[PDB]
């Protein structure tokens, strides 16, 4: 399948999307961007540049790579 958002292929562009990322979310922009996730600007809601998979309600103890892979098995980025 196709890369859903090529504008967010750069890990640096994913990091820059984390403006006003909330304190309660616990996971950092650095970890989320490294797992292919960028910020949508809403709550703690992130999206994968590769599969377009959407993730929210991050809890302390979550790992960005694990949640991404477990919920989106079709994703080429975390496969």
């Amino acid at each position: 399948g196709h890369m859903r958002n090529p504008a967010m292929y750069s890990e640096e562009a994913r990091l820059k999307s984390f403006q006003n990322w909330p304190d309660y979310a616990h996971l950092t922009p650095r970890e989320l961007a490294s797992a292919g996730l960028y910020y949508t600007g809403i709550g703690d809601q992130v999206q994968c540049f590769a599969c377009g998979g959407k993730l929210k309600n991050w809890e302390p103890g979550d790992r960005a790579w694990s949640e991404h892979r477990r919920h989106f098995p079709n994703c080429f980025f975390v496969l």
Binding site: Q45, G53, K54, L55, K56, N57, W58, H71
Partner: peptide
Amino acid sequence: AVXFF
């Protein structure tokens, strides 16, 4: 985390 659509 939970997925959403």
